[PDB]
Amino acid sequence: AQYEDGKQYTTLEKPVAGAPQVLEFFSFFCPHCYQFEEVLHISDNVKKKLPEGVKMTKYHVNFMGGDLGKDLTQAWAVAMALGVEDKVTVPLFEGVQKTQTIRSASDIRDVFINAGIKGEEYDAAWNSFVVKSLVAQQEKAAADVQLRGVPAMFVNGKYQLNPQGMDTSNMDVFVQQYADTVKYLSEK
């Protein structure tokens, strides 16, 4: 076939029921994740090729960057709760990987403040049990799929994207192959 298990995707021997339709995992410490966001715009290009009525989910993971990694998972929960993902994603990536000005929870907080979220609002969310359960959700979704590497994308809790098996000579061609694979898998 043109799309083959073990080529553009792998199949979970242990499928996950009730999973989000398109589920992406990343870390702000993850160098390919940086590229996926700023250079390739993977999520947005996948979105453009999916029907509508398909929900897309993106979760942060703990297994990179130790204590700061977990702070970032909680901050990402704050971003989801407040709906400000599109305002903090780029400065969090750049603060961790480019300027390396993110070294503490307070530095993460600074990114949100500079993006216009108010102190009161950030701190209230940070300490809320809505954000606690949102952290729990990120952890459980990753746990369900044996996750030891990012970036990762899972379609309907049964297929995992395999970008290693796509041409990388041309960044644009890579992105479309990836997005077209997600679409194929979603129609499966």
DSSP code at position 29: T
Contacts 24+ apart (CB under 8 A), 125-131: 125/78, 125/81, 125/82, 126/74, 126/75, 126/78, 128/81, 130/81, 131/74, 131/77, 131/78, 131/81
Question: Is the distance from CB of 115 to CB of 91 less than 8 angstroms?
Answer: yes
Question: Is the distance from CB of 186 to CB of 157 less than 8 angstroms?
Answer: no
Residues 6 or more apart in contact with residue 47 via CB below 8 angstroms? 56
Method of structure determination: X-ray
Please give the Cα distance from 182 to 162 (Å, whole number): 10
Strand pairing report for 22-26 and 56-60: parallel
Please give the Cα distance from 102 to 108 (Å, whole number): 6
Using alpha carbons only, give the angle 174, 160, 49 rounded to the nearest 5 degrees: 50
Resolution of the coordinates in A? 1.9
Using alpha carbons only, give the angle 63, 66, 69 rounded to the nearest 5 degrees: 70
Please give the Cα distance from 17 to 180 (Å, whole number): 23
Domain spans of the chain, in order of start: 1-188
State the DSSP string of 124-158.
HHHH-HHHHHHHHHHHHHHHHTT--SSSEEEETTT
For residue 83, give Cα distances in angstroms to 16, 102, 186. 26, 21, 25
Superfamily of domain 1-188: Glutaredoxin (3.40.30.10)
Please give the Cα distance from 100 to 92 (Å, whole number): 10
